[PDB]
Symmetry: D2
Subunit: 221 residues, 4 copies
């Protein structure tokens, strides 16, 4: 079994606060979630508190609403979990195959049994007739992030794909940079498999429930 | 002489309001500017009003503070000036050669003799020992933007370069998408030459003055 | 068990013919290999026949010397194996994180018990003091290609990483496009895990022996 | 007037030898050219000699057929002309907006009154229904290359655009790296304007004539 850290219970909740701008439209979202950090399981309920209903696909926000909830096997150092109680920050670029770009920054803290995430997203050049502004997406495929240490930062790359109405895929590249706020034991080259689903939502996606499973590992061969 | 639009005087002022995050650091800036829109000359005084003094090179913000102040020869339609009084928006990506990326959005309107600009920037993945975080930049080379029409929008690209303390250059690619808030007459493929200098600043760059000359043209050949 | 095709025996050999140019240096390589296509196992012995010894790292050529040797599970259509006897072509871009770029094209045929591969590589902008021209690489990490169907072509993306002398990683992005020469049954979204090793070589890598294991699969979750 | 190097006459000829592969199709081309190097004027007659008639737009080859024929004002050092008699090499990437990519390498020498060019191109991932494979291009816009010195090499970038049958543009980014075969005096940051036209061709573009004007300069402001 993997070393559990005492500041992170086997059952934890969290609060997430998002603000951002996508194609010039400002908006804010708040969520409360919960899960089992050492099993890699979590769920979150989101509420659009400003700028709703959103004129773009909800799916582009889904993977922005909790990386402490990743199951790590015994021999792989868990970068993110070691960073607590002080916490971590990360920065992410999303490059969509039709030219749209998002930049994302996150600050993560802990208060007792509850993680606190603050996240900002900026999105530009989503084509007006594209699957995002026309809400043609049907959730992400499961995906695998490739992670490795560099300058005491963790670096993640992920080939993502939104499912399209009536077959087809809309590609997105994730590049992520994770920075603990204190020095920790770096892991080596490894992967995290993820599966993310919207399990329920209202008509204009102003209330949304998501859930995720994330499990780290070495190569299979 | 180029046609002059009655809603834009030969001398104008403007106010610019900017908020943003760069490597996770929030900041706000306000500016007051003036110039001669049909001669392509302007100056602006900027004040950091939140999150100052900034921990990053001022030069990455410089080109975000007024495209109505571009001189257009008579035979080239002026996309930006035609958009008034309704105004315009634009979005910009900034891709630096060490992998930092900025997304920018802008909304621009007019009140009498005064343009009003609202601009938001999100910049991520500046290397902590690179010339931006170590404030080693020494202003921008004069540059040229290539512009053409597509789908009712004016598309621009610019290979920019920052000057480096100790000679040499730090490269940045600009991609811009300008969208008038009403249909306007579309120009053909053309160029805009620009020179942009910081003419004065205090020690921690919390007060900065910039001067810019911008002139559109056809190919020189 | 997966459907085996009659034109592809459980034990097969192959011949591979490479010519190319890397940083302006022309060279040619020939290899003979063998393996078990339905088990995903193969080995190949390469000989540099022109332009040797090569002034660059052998590792940049390794993943160019046999995709019929991929183990597919029963329920996933095997695009490449269906394309025979007529065969297939593919095109690949390799984008290295220090700016170097390779383009690759391949034509694959079959004669009896022996596949025949013709491959061309063009490589440019490898920095003269980089790990490639200074031969600092220490083989690839195992990796996973993400594959999906589009316009009856198969499309693969792979986040690759060369191991560096004294710790460290040198990243490379693979984008591949595979085209059967006759229509076949397209698969859905899936992955291929690969592990590629140089098992033996002489002093200046003019004779090189490699081996590979490649196994397709769905997501693990 | 700019200094004139004694090894380069006011009128010169040149031979150009080209081989390459585009979407897997091999071809060779030979050309004979002439012009006035210090005035920046040249013409060239090309003959497809293998793999003709070409199944792809001739325009993607056009800018690969002689940079000594660039007029340099007196105060800007001429990197290419100083390199002689030894000569130079260069490498170029061509990135089209629908994801096609070309890598190019060149070697250039001199025999008396005649430059000799050897050039290789590899182009991949042209979409089969795009304007290159469907021969819908109508020549290149006049363009400007940005040039600066780094590590003894002259680096160039150019936002190019092909004209499209039916108005509109198909964008391509040029990155070029020019390397003299001996140390030379390095120019500062500057530009080269170019116009390149096909002046005549037969029906299947197996004989083509091109004309190019190239003039270096500082920023216009």
């Amino acid at each position: 079994s993997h070393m559990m850290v005492s500041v992170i219970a086997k059952q934890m909740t969290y609060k997430v606060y998002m603000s951002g701008t996508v194609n010039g439209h400002y908006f804010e979202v708040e969520g409360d979630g919960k899960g089992k950090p050492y099993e890699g399981e979590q769920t979150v309920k989101l509420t659009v508190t400003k700028g709703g209903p959103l004129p773009f696909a909800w799916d582009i926000l889904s993977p922005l609403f909790s990386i402490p909830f990743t199951k790590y096997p015994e021999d792989i150092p868990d970068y993110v979990k070691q960073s607590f109680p002080e916490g971590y920050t990360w920065e992410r670029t999303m490059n969509f195959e039709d030219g749209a770009v998002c930049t994302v920054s996150n600050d993560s803290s802990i208060q007792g049994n509850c993680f606190i995430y603050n996240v900002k997203i900026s999105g530009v050049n989503f084509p007006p007739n594209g699957p995002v502004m026309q809400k043609k997406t049907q959730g992400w495929e499961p995906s695998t992030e490739r992670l490795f240490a560099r300058d005491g930062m963790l670096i993640g790359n992920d080939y993502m794909a939104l499912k399209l109405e009536g077959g087809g895929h809309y590609l997105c590249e994730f590049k992520s940079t994770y920075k603990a706020k204190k020095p920790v034991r770096m892991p080596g080259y490894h992967y995290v498999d993820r599966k993310l689903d919207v399990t329920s939502h209202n008509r204009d996606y102003t209330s949304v429930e998501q859930c995720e499973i994330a499990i780290a590992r070495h190569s299979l061969l």
